[PDB]
Amino acid sequence: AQPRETWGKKIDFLLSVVGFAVDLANVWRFPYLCYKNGGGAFLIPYTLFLIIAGMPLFYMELALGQYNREGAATVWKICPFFKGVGYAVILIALYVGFYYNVIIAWSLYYLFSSFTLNLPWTDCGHTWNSPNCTDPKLLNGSVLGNHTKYSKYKFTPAAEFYERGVLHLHESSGIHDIGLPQWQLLLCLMVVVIVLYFSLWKGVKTSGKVVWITATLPYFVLFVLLVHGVTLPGASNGINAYLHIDFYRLKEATVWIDAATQIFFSLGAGFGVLIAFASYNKFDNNCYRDALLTSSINCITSFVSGFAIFSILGYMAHEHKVNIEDVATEGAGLVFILYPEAISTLSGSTFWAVVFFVMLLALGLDSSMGGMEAVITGLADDFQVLKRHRKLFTFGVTFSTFLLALFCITKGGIYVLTLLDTFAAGTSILFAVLMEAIGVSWFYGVDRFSNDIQQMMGFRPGLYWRLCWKFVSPAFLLFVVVVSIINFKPLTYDDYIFPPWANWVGWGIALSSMVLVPIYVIYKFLSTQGSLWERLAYGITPENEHHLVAQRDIRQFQLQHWLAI
Amino acid sequence: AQPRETWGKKIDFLLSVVGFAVDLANVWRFPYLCYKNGGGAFLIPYTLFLIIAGMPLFYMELALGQYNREGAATVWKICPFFKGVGYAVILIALYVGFYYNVIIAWSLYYLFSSFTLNLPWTDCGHTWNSPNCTDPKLLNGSVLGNHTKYSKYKFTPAAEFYERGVLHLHESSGIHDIGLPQWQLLLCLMVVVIVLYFSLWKGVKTSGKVVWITATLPYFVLFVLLVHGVTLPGASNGINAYLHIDFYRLKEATVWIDAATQIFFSLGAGFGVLIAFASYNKFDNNCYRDALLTSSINCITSFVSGFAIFSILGYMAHEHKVNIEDVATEGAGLVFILYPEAISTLSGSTFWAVVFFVMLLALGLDSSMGGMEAVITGLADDFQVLKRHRKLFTFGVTFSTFLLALFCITKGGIYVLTLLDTFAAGTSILFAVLMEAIGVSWFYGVDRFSNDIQQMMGFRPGLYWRLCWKFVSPAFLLFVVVVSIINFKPLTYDDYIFPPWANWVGWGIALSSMVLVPIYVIYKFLSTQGSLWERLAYGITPENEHHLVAQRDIRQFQLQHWLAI
Ligand SMILES: CN(C)CCC=C1c2ccccc2CCc2ccccc21
Ligand SMILES: [Cl-]
Numbered sequence A, B: 001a002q003p004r005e006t007w008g009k010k011i012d013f014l015l016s017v018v019g020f021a022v023d024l025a026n027v028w029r030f031p032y033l034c035y036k037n038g039g040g041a042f043l044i045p046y047t048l049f050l051i052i053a054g055m056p057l058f059y060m061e062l063a064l065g066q067y068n069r070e071g072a073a074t075v076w077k078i079c080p081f082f083k084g085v086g087y088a089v090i091l092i093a094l095y096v097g098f099y100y101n102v103i104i105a106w107s108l109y110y111l112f113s114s115f116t117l118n119l120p121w122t123d124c125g126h127t128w129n130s131p132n133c134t135d136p137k138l139l140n141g142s143v144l145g146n147h148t149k150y151s152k153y154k155f156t157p158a159a160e161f162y163e164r165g166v167l168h169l170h171e172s173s174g175i176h177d178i179g180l181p182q183w184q185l186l187l188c189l190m191v192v193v194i195v196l197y198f199s200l201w202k203g204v205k206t207s208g209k210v211v212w213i214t215a216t217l218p219y220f221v222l223f224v225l226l227v228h229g230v231t232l233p234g235a236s237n238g239i240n241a242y243l244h245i246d247f248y249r250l251k252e253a254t255v256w257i258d259a260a261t262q263i264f265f266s267l268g269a270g271f272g273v274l275i276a277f278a279s280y281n282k283f284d285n286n287c288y289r290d291a292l293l294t295s296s297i298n299c300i301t302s303f304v305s306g307f308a309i310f311s312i313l314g315y316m317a318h319e320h321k322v323n324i325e326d327v328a329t330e331g332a333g334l335v336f337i338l339y340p341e342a343i344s345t346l347s348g349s350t351f352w353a354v355v356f357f358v359m360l361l362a363l364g365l366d367s368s369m370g371g372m373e374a375v376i377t378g379l380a381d382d383f384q385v386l387k388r389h390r391k392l393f394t395f396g397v398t399f400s401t402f403l404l405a406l407f408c409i410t411k412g413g414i415y416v417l418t419l420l421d422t423f424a425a426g427t428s429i430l431f432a433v434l435m436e437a438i439g440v441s442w443f444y445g446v447d448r449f450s451n452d453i454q455q456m457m458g459f460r461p462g463l464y465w466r467l468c469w470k471f472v473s474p475a476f477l478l479f480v481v482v483v484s485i486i487n488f489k490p491l492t493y494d495d496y497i498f499p500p501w502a503n504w505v506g507w508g509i510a511l512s513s514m515v516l517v518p519i520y521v522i523y524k525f526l527s528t529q530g531s532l533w534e535r536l537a538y539g540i541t542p543e544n545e546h547h548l549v550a551q552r553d554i555r556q557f558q559l560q561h562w563l564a565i
């Protein structure tokens, strides 16, 4: 009926991929995975995975979504067997937006609080925060005793505003008792979901305009933070520990699960957002150049973000007493601790804080609307009734996201947020990208994919990209999944410990999306009325080429198809 | 499409409506309301409210669901402006379906525990019950004394078992800290919902056959319990106190408004279940005799169950050497705290303890199946897609009920259960039955409703039934609603007091169903196109009489319609 919708401008796609790719502000926590005796621990594995897995998977997803011109779930009409990975990545993006809207609400609350002339992080009083009053220690306001107290800095005005004034974490004991959702956080979440609905109910062109307006100057805040970090006298000590140039210090074997999760969140692999955005893209586009540009931009952004973060770390460690490693909270609120104290020192604390919070709101809204648009595109291409009624389905999705995010905005919502993020994100995106690589490279065929690319644009992927798609990336993803299943530590906060049932709940939430692949395989095997050979043929052959099943001509059965690279 | 299913035999429909009318509310509440409200003089208004206010509301649904063989919601095709109240009686049936099955779990977990020779409520200790350090005392063997009534004494083995060993309320403080759902009760709830799905997944065919067992065993259980209690020492005093005629009670407070609410919540007229059950019956079936027999069976069953209840209460009063007013209780305190404690002191306690709880299970199974089939039929006749997919829609409904009943089976779910029951049931179903009576007796017309009955069975209801449908029933429902609004008390438990925000959320849940009538009126007024008199005439006239609207012939705009009885 209605033709396939497309972008209004080609530059809109290159801006939207970055607006969804700008998550290195908050999700890039270097001191969390900081080194112990290795030096480079979150930059060597990050770059390695971006080189060997990031760019190949980005190019593969872009070309697949551009050629098939379908959603994440209906891209697997080229191999109906591995079609459960579409629902898997849809649930992945849904669970991710669930806690991403919480970060957006936190940023909105900080933006609303920063309007005051006196910032809430400039004194140790009752300035919109909730100090316990046991340790009202002004970092530079008054002289205090040099007591480390485990070198922990959680009584600073920034932390007292974050974990007590914004989150109200003191009222909740833990995951077992989360309390009631906060009213101000509820209003913030309602405003966020209303903005998302008003941005997404129109179409992809409105989302393109929104990512154009919001992502206009995200780099400027990072640039001014970096230029203020290194120019100030006492902030070089921490950044010196950051760029620890040790090529013979080794604490890991370049193996990290959090690095893979970070590259997948940055690029978008395992969420269906790349395929969904490539579906609306034009037929003739250089996905290779776009992938290289996106990877380079993400690498530079990660580098400058780590620079600024460790510069603020060293500034805190010099202007204050306790050491660098325990000065800030390593978790989902690292930037909320770092950036307010840094902006308090800089001139014009109110204006720059407002600008930084507007940037955070912009990037968060962009990423969340990208994920929600990917989910909507997938479930609309899957069910044409949902594609016809786009507004009702969008309203339903936004309302479900708002309802299922109340457990993350409550008194102890940060614990559920971290649990969901870690378990769901890591395990689900790992299994999803592994299954997608196995299906595209082996079952569908690297030769057929390369031929489709050559028919799409003149240039053909060389030996490097094909060998990465076929051998390097699937083996890497399988090894990461194995090291994640084996080397699994119990989920915990900086100080709070989770009961054993929280780990089981997280594993069950991950498995809910994981088992979506074998369930659909069994569904396809049982639905087809035929012999075992005919079932296996209908399983691993495209829908358009199903007639060849009747002609007894299947390429996957022969070993020449598998051996071909 | 294909014609809907029908009852193979009218005995199935009769037993189904009997099992729906006869539930746990006729065992724990009716005898206590009889005793407290003057003894025997409570039968004078009750039967009165049975005849003038309860019986005409039971003949109104069996004749509206048989002439218009539709669901609870879709039956409002004679007056679309009230179809919203057809949705409320569905949503209410969901709000009642969450906690009610929990009670069905309470009778299941007590059944398995009664499969041992030593019942868990016969002695003090850790016999499947969580005991206090030094608080509990033994019922028999102590002649020290007592200064408090045994109805609220929570230091007995049975009460402590019911609270801590079953509900686990000792490790909870209120709705703010409910805790995690009990797995030993989650398994019982799973078994209950599985039985419900297996009964209702293939239509009325399997439900009618399950009712043949689940609606005939409770009568045998009551018969054997009465024939055993009539020989128990001390039952004569209980029978005399239950049948004591005290005509001194002439006050409206608790004597004239308690029999009305008891009749209303015992007969079940206006819940939407009767419209669904009467939609699978033949067009020539007599609804008059069916309604009369159902009301008489309900009232006689309540009256004869009061005999066994008070025989057990008199036996316990003689054993405890206390008066009957001290061992007089209602609700779960009777069937779970008072009756098992009395069975403990009987001979062959295993048989009686198994048969009492299997009667309690059979009483709840019929009511839950009816309340769920009401929603099923109301949503299937409205949405034609759900008619073909019944085995999936019933499964979805059961799974949603199970997931939304996890807040009542937890360590502190009794408070949420009481909140839901009281607010939702009372307020929403009262407003719903009031709107239904107003729509059927005034807007549609009692003369047309009598002509429909005359076309169905051949005879037309006399002037008494029309007078009790047009004037008596609406005024009675309005009086009950006004009393419920005025005599509304703040939510409270035995000792715990609900927070101020509990009353507001309870009222919100109650209004969620009640606002569906004005919202649907506005929706119907805005959807229809034309002038005000052309949009109003399309919501008060039947869909088969809309052509008369084009001919400027509307009967609801004349004085003869409103002044005809
Ligand atoms: C026992 N007769 C009187 C009806 C009792 C049963 C229910 C019930 C039970 C289980 C599931 C749904 C429902 C919906 C109908 C309703 C409405 C108000 C109060 C109670 C009830
Ligand atoms: Cl009754």
Ligand code: NA
Residues within 6 Å of the ligand: B018, B019, B020, B021, B022, B023, B214, B215, B362, B363, B364, B365, B366, B367
């Ligand atoms: Na029953």
